[PDB]
Every structure is written in C-alpha cells, then in structure tokens.
Amino acid sequence: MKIMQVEKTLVSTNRIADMGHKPLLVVWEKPGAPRQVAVDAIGCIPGDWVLCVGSSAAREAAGSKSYPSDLTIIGIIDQWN
Amino acid sequence: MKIMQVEKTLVSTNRIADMGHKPLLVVWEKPGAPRQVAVDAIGCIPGDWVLCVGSSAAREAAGSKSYPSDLTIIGIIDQWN
Amino acid sequence: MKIMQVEKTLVSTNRIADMGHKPLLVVWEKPGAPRQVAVDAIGCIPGDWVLCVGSSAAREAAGSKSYPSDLTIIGIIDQWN
Amino acid sequence: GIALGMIETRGLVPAIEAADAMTKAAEVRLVGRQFVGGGYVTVLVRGETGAVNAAVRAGADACERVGDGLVAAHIIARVHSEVENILPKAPQ
Amino acid sequence: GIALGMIETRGLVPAIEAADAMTKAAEVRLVGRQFVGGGYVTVLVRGETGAVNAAVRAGADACERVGDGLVAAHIIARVHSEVENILPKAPQ
Amino acid sequence: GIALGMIETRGLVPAIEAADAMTKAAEVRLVGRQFVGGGYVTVLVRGETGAVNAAVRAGADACERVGDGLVAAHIIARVHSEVENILPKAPQ
Amino acid sequence: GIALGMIETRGLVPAIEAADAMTKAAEVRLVGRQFVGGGYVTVLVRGETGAVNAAVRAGADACERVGDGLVAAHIIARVHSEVENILPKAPQ
Amino acid sequence: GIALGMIETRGLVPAIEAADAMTKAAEVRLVGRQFVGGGYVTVLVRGETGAVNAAVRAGADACERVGDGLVAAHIIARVHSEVENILPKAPQ
Amino acid sequence: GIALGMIETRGLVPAIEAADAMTKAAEVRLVGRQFVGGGYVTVLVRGETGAVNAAVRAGADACERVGDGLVAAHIIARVHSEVENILPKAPQ
Amino acid sequence: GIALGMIETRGLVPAIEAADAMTKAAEVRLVGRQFVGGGYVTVLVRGETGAVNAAVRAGADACERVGDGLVAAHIIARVHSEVENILPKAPQ
Amino acid sequence: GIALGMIETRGLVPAIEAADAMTKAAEVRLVGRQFVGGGYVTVLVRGETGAVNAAVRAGADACERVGDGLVAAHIIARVHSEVENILPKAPQ
Amino acid sequence: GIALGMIETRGLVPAIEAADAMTKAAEVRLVGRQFVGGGYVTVLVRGETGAVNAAVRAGADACERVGDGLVAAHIIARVHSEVENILPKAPQ
Amino acid sequence: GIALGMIETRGLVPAIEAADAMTKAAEVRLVGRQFVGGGYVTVLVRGETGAVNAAVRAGADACERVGDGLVAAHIIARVHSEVENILPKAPQ
C-alpha cells in the first residue's frame, strides 16, 4: 500500500455502470506528484492522508470481486504530515 | 486508476481473436509522456481526458473475466484540463 | 519480492473492517526512498531488513484470498545491511 | 450550479452521514437540513447536474445502512423559480 | 386564478418533487409549503382552474414514487372567503 | 353565535376541504386551524347552533374521503368561559 | 480532534445514558443533543478518532438496554466543512 | 446530591403523576420536564443516591398504570461533567 | 455542452412528449426532430453530460406511456467530428 | 391559449375526422397536420387548457371508430420554449 | 482509403450510435447516412481496409443493443467503380 | 364563459340541491330550471369550461343521493348558435 | 497517552508473544507484566487510544494460538485516577 494525500473529488458522468455509486478522489503521494484516482471506500476530505491499495485488492476493498478499481482508499492515517 | 488523454486510435488487424471487436486508443498521461494503449469501453474522442484502470480490473471493465486487457478506459472526466 | 527496511508503525483507526487486526508498518527500500505501507505478517521491529511481496501474493500472505493488501512482509532477512 | 439534490432519512444520524458522503463525493453546496417532523430529516445540496448526481448516488449508498435508513434520494436538474423560493439558501 | 391545488406527502422530498412538477406542468404560483407535523408536508398552489387541474395531476403522478409517497391530491375550484384566512399567501 | 364546531383530520388537506365545505354549507366563520402534532389538524368554526350543526355535518362528509380522512367532528352549542382561553379567536 | 461520534435513540433517557457512557469511556466532549421529532434524540460528541471510536462503542452498549433503545451509533473520522454548519458547537 | 433520576412516559399525565410520586417519596428536586417529541415526556430529578433510588422506584410504580404508561426509569449515581451541559437546571 | 441525447419513438406524439419532458427536466436545447420513415421519430438535444443524462432519463419515462411508446433513449457524452455532419443544428 | 393537443391516427381519414371534431368541440386553432411516415398522421391544435381538453376528448372519441383508428391522444398544458421550435405554426 | 463500410439499423438512434463508434474506432471518413425508407437507416464510411474493418466491428458491437438493433454490418475492401457512383461522397 | 352544464334529476329537490352545489363549487351562472314533464327537472348553468366542469361534477356528486336521484350530467364546451335558441337566458 | 491496554494469558510464553506483537504494532509503552498467580499472566501497555486499540488487536490475534492461549484483551481509553494507582508504572 501507498500513503497518499487527497487532492479533490472527480466526477465522470458517463463512467461504466459497474463502477456503482462509489465516489472517486484525485490523490497524489505528495503535492506536485503525478495524480491518480482512487475509489473512496472511506469517505475522506481534501488534505487527508490516506492509505491506498492497488492491484486486485482494491477491487474487493471497493466492495466486490468484480469491481473495476485498481486503487482504493482503505483508511485515513491517524497521524501523518 | 490514472488520468489520461486520448491521443488517437490504434488498429491491429492480426490481433488475437480474444480481443473481440473492442476499439483500441493510444493515450498518454500528458502530451509527450510515454504512450500506452487502452481498450475503449466508453467511446471517447482524441483530446478527451479519461479514466484508465489497469491490473485485472481492466479485463472485466472490457467485458469479461478472460479479456486480454491491462488498461481500459472506464469513463470520461466531466471537467479536466 | 523486494528488500525493504522497516521505518515505523502506522495506525489507521477508521480503516476498513476487512483489514482485520493485522499490523501495518511504514517501510522504505532505503533511508530516504519513497515510503510504503506493508502488512506485518511476521512481527518485525524498526531497522529490520524484511522481504516484501506485492501483487496478489500479498493478500494470501496476509491470511486470506480476499485480504486487502498489496504489500506484505513475509520474512526477516537473517543477514543484511 | 442550480441543480438540486435531496436525501430524506428516518432520524438525524443517517442524514448527517448522507450529507457527509454527498459533500465529500462532489463539489456540492450543502444548503439545508430540515426536520420535517415525525422523524424525517431532509438534507438539500445545490450544484451542477453532474456534481449533484454523483453526490446523491454516493450519499444514498452511504446512508442506506445507517439507522432506520433511507427514505428518498432525488435529483432535480432543472428547478423552477417558484420552487427555489421554498428551498433554504443556507443551513441553520 | 383563484383555484387552489393541494398535495400531501409523507416527507419533504416528495413534496418538493411534486411542487416542482406542479410548477412546470402549468402556470400555477406555489403559494405555500407547510410542515403539518407527523411527517406530513403539504404544498399549496393557486391558479386558473384548468391550470390547477393539470398541475395537480402532474404533481401527484410525479410524487407517487418518491420517498414514502403521496397522501392526498385535491383541487378546490373556488374557495370560500373564510378559507383564505388559513391559506398562505407566499412561502418562506 | 357562540356555538363551536370542530373538525379533526389526519393531515392538512382534508382539513382544508372540511373548512371549505363548512363555510360553504352554513353561515359560520372559520375561527382557527391548529396543528396538533402527529399529523392531526383541527379546524374550528363559530356560529349559531343550527348553522354550526349543518356546517359540521357537511364538513365531515366532505373530508371523509380526502387524504387520510376524518378523526372527529364535534359540536358544542355553548362553550364554557374557561374554554374560550384555549380557543383561538382568529386564524393565523 | 475533529472526529464526530453520533448516537441516536428513541427517547431522551437512553440518549442521556449513552452520553454519560460516551463521556465516561473516552476523552470526548459532548457537543450537542438534538430532538429530531418523532421521539428520536441524537447525542453528538467530538474528539480524536480512537477516542470517538471507544466512546461510541461504549455508548451504544450502555443505551442498548435503556427505554426504547438505540437507533444508530455512527462514527465519522473527518467531517466535511459543509457538514459543520449543521453540527451544533455547544449543547443548550 | 448529584445523582440523576429519569422517567420517560408516553404522554404528559403519567409524567406528572411520576414526578409527583418521585417528589413525595424522597427529597429530590425535580429539575426538569422535557417534551421529547413523538409523545415521549421525560422528567428529571436530582438528589442523593438513595433518595433518587427510592424516588425513581416510586415514580415508576406510580406511573406504570397511568395513561399509555412508562417507557424508561433510569438512575445515574454520578454523571460526567459533559452531561450536565444537556441536563436542565430548573423547569419552566 | 457537446453531449448528445437521443430519443426515438413510434410516432410523433410520444416524441413531442419526450422532447417537452427532456427540456423541462434539464438545461438542454432541442437541436432537432427527424422523421426516419416507418413511423420512427427521433428527437435530439445537446448539452452538458449530466444535463443530457437527466433529460434523456426524464424523456424516456415520460414518453414510455404515450402512443406506441419508446424505441431508444441513448446518450453520447462526446460526439466525433464526423458525426456532427449528420446531426441537425436547428429544428425546422 | 398556449396549451397543445395532439392526436395520432393510422391514416389521414381518422386524422381529418378527429381534427374536425376537435375544432367543433371547443375553440382551438388547428395549427398542424403532419404525415409522420409509416401511415401515422398527427393533428396538432393550440388553445386554452380547458378548451384543448374538451377538444382532444371529442377528437379521440370521434376518430376511434374511423379507419384503422386512433394511436395517441395527448394534452400538454404548457410546453417548453424549446418545443415550440418543432411545433408548426399553421398547416399547409 | 477506397474500402467501404456499411451499417444498417432499424431507426436513426442506433445508426448515430454505430457511426459514432465507427468514427471513434479508426481513421474512417463518414461519407453518408441514408434513410432507406420504412425504418432502415444506413451509415457509410470510407477508409483503408484495416481501418474500415476495425471501425465496422466496433460499430456493430456498439449498436447491436441500441433500439431495434442492427440489420447489417458489411465490409467491402475492393469496390467497383460503378458502385462508387451510387455511393454518397459527403453526408447531408 | 359560453360552456353549458346540464343536470337532470327525478324531482325538484335533487335539482335544487344540484343547482346550489353547482353555484357554490365554481363561478357559473344558473341560467335555468325546466320542468320537463314526467318528473324530470333539468338545471342549466353557463360559464367558463373549467368552471362548468367543476360545477357539474360537484352537482352530480351532491344530488346522486337526494330523493329519486340523478339522471344525467352533461357538459358542452361550446354549443352551436342554433342551440342557444332553446337555452333559457335566465330562470323565472 | 493515558489509554490502557491489557492482555491476559494462560502461561508466560503467550504473554511475551502478545507483548511483542503489541509493542511492534503501535507506539505503546509496555508498563507491566504481572503474574496473577495460578497460571494467569497479564501484560499492560499505555498509549494514546488509537495506538492502544491497534496494539491490543494485533496482540490478541498474535497470541490467540500460542500455548493455552488468550483469556482477555481489553482496552480502557479513559482510566480513572484511582485505577492509575493500582497500575504498574514500569515493568520488573
């Protein structure tokens, strides 16, 4: 897993139906790093430091064996900066 | 997932039969970045900003557990630049 | 697998329930390298040199086919520096 | 954004959970939380249509399980001026 | 336009949906929204008789499948002067 | 006249219909409309005993079919002085 | 800490027991008590995520057996800015 | 005397009967009566622990067969300082 | 916005109802109405993706019950340049 | 008079009969007759809401038993400004 | 590219969807959209053989589900000069 | 207001009740009461189309359970000029 | 960190394993290891609530399998001053 910061939210209206109703967050490792999009399984706010899992664990972390996710937020770090 | 821009289309006539009839798009993260090829599960145009999922979620995102894809477009970003 | 050094521990109180009771360690490849978080399936201390497996093997290494891990410590190197 | 999203819940805890999910899901303005009386609580957000759509879907899926649950998750993309009058502008 | 149209809903979300549909279907001024207590919310529109008829039918059809649903949809073509004392002039 | 007519309903819309029928049927003045909590709405009229009788009968029949219906339709020919302190004099 | 703990109950007495247990179990400040209508009472505390977790668990167990019981015991580690306008800051 | 005694009733008549019995059974100051919404009424007395115990038992016994009855009877021997912020000092 | 919403119907009357509902539901401009031959009539609107989504959903539901009904309700978020030569720009 | 009434028929003879009945039943201006393709013919009248209602009922009743019959009879009490672009102003 | 791709659909919405898919799938020139009459709509693209092949396969798989669906997806790699004459050069 | 509303009753008492209900329900001028012979009594009101509709529905509903009852309730939205010669201008 | 975590085991080897897991799982201070007598061994750590929670869960899951296993894994987030007195400050 990777330690990320939540930049903002992302909306894709025409995304595939298999994505469900799950929210999407734009996150980076650090301000200025390349952006990625994570499935928000936790409900965090911009500026949060979060734990992100990739590979196939993100699919079940987002709620199903078949979920189309390769990056999912699975927790908020209690103390990080 | 990653945020990509669609460069163009790609045609491979002799590609494996398991690829089906699905279109292929050449995308980059940003103009000048290394190119990749994504399965177009959405139907986007060049210049679009799209969401791309890798790993094994791209296979089901392209329509099957067994689909030969490691990068699939799963949505068009409503507002990006 | 990768050879990592354990930096410290990480606590995420509101992490998903599927993470179980398993501890989380902040590790780097070398001091100053980008940090990652690994599931501690071994019980190591800061300063240890450990073996970390990624991809889908980390899930079963952490105890289940369905475990939400993409990085798990699976051993302590007897002799490393 | 002149689109409107509404979520109704039995009790206030699911309403707060739904409003939290909606405001963390998209760029939407939480413009009201009304106690309808009898147990119902309604939470109203404003924003552009895509933002409101995404926010309301996330909030519904987040508050379906909480408490006595969800009663309604409705999106109005085009709201008549007359309706605007009855809609709270700011939450109290 | 002195005809009165009324809609009751169990909850505020179906009430808002019914008011929006009413205002969009015909030229009726939404003169009020009352929390009745117990969860009942009523929406009151004033307009021409045919306008109110069309609006109330559209509102009932729109809010039957929203939230807990619809309770009452009523049209009074001409109300007594005594009744105007308990009818709101404009919402708040 | 100091005779009191009362009609109680579940919800405001049958109460409005009952008040309209009451004032259309007999020479009675709508003296109040009270939200009781829980959905109960009561409409109070004052007039002569015969007038109040006719009005309450008409209102009961009119509102029996509207919304969640009628709860009570009661007639008091002469109200005690002490009961005039809990009876509204004008409808807000 | 900005983590929010919520407990909803039918009736005030289980809410009081839950608030007492919540504040006795962990370092959390009682930030509000809201009557929701219909008998729902919610108690809101603020603190660090671990503290709020322990407090909400203790409050849920304590008030599960009191009166008409518990409705919801929810934990939000980080509340959105927009949701702080509908969250009371001090209990009246 | 910092012990807290609570009684919930469905309605105000059993609440008043329970408060009177509580005050007569032991030296406890009735510090509040709250309408909770939904029909729940709660009565809150403060006093010495044994006094509150005797008073709450007498109040529950007195109000079980009054009106719709009793919902909750609870004693907290010592409440947290955070809880005193949501406890009334005197009724009104 | 350059998102395209299409609704096809058997016959013109359900197409008119669908276009009315589409434009009443969201901020979309009616960009054309095409007689296809055989009874097929298609109505085309343009706007932002969220707006077009809401409009096409509303139009589909509205015209499903009118006349011979609905054939297709499709949404294209971004149309290719080549497809804009076969898409009418204004309705005659 | 901005209400719109529509009638579809399978064939031109029931369409003409329905238009004649519509024009005779109420003061509505027949603003169009469209060959839709496939045999569908639609007739469009504009007028006051009650007038259009009466006219459309008379037209449907008159043309149900003429030729292949009636397909659709629809009234829109108020159409959106976008829809007027696809509504004929006068026939030819 | 002198290769030709054709897609036939029942209705215009699947034809537009198929043309969108074809033009987004490969470098092909949308050279026509013909209303054959009776409900059929044909969409014609020109390009090199591989482009046309890929585009027609994508368009067929995209429009199979839309509306009343697909009728034909045919590729002609070598088209006779005589045929070219009957083929539209530009879409109207 | 040139719409015509008619009610037949078996007897004069249901006719008078229907005329009173008609006049109270909507602004319609009662232009006549005819003894038809045989026990039939007809009441004729003139007014706006929606007004006449509301009035005739109210009159039929009021006089169905009065005396021998109701025979016919009919609305003509616009009558021919020849028919006005057999329609009374005012009763006597 | 004034939160307390305790783990009780049958035998000392599972206690050492549990203390190892707890101290490697979070920032917690191992403040005691008591031989209760009879076979029980208790291990006590202090820290902030989240640290203690994570550490105790890891230690319980680590020592459940070792030896005769676990007896108790308890977390106290808020510990009374009196209790602190009985708690060892340093391990011996």
Numbering used by the authors:
A (entry chain A), B (entry chain A), C (entry chain A): 1 to 81
D (entry chain C), E (entry chain E), F (entry chain D), G (entry chain D), H (entry chain E), I (entry chain D), ...: 6 to 97
Question: What do the study authors state?
Answer:
The carboxysome is composed of a polyhedral shell that encapsulates the key CO2-fixation enzyme, ribulose-1,5-bisphosphate carboxylase/oxygenase (Rubisco), and carbonic anhydrase (CA), which dehydrates HCO3− to CO2, the substrate for Rubisco carboxylation. In α-carboxysomes, the disordered linker protein CsoS2 plays an essential role in carboxysome assembly and Rubisco encapsulation. In this work, we synthetically engineer α-carboxysome shells using minimal shell components derived from a chemoautotroph Halothiobacillus (H.) neapolitanus, a model system in the fundamental studies and synthetic engineering, and determine high-resolution cryoEM structures of the shells of variable constituents.
A medium sized shell (~23 nm, T = 4) is present in both constructs in low abundance. Three different sized shells with T = 3, T = 4 and T = 9 icosahedral symmetries are built of essentially the same hexameric CsoS1A and pentameric CsoS4A, which are highly conserved across α-cyanobacteria and many proteobacteria. All the shell proteins possess the same concave-out orientation, consistent with other shell assemblies. Intriguingly, only T = 9 shells generated from mini-shell 2 contain extra densities not accounted for by CsoS1A and CsoS4A at the inner surface of the shell, which are absent in T = 4 and T = 3 shells. The angles between capsomeres in interfaces 1 and 2 vary slightly among three shells, from 30° to 35° and 30° to 43°, respectively, leading to small curvature changes in the shell assembly, thus the size differences. Despite a large deviation of the tilt angle (from 0° to 43°), the main interactions at the interface between adjacent hexamers, which is mediated by the hydrogen bond network involving Lys29, Ala30, and Arg83, remain largely conserved.
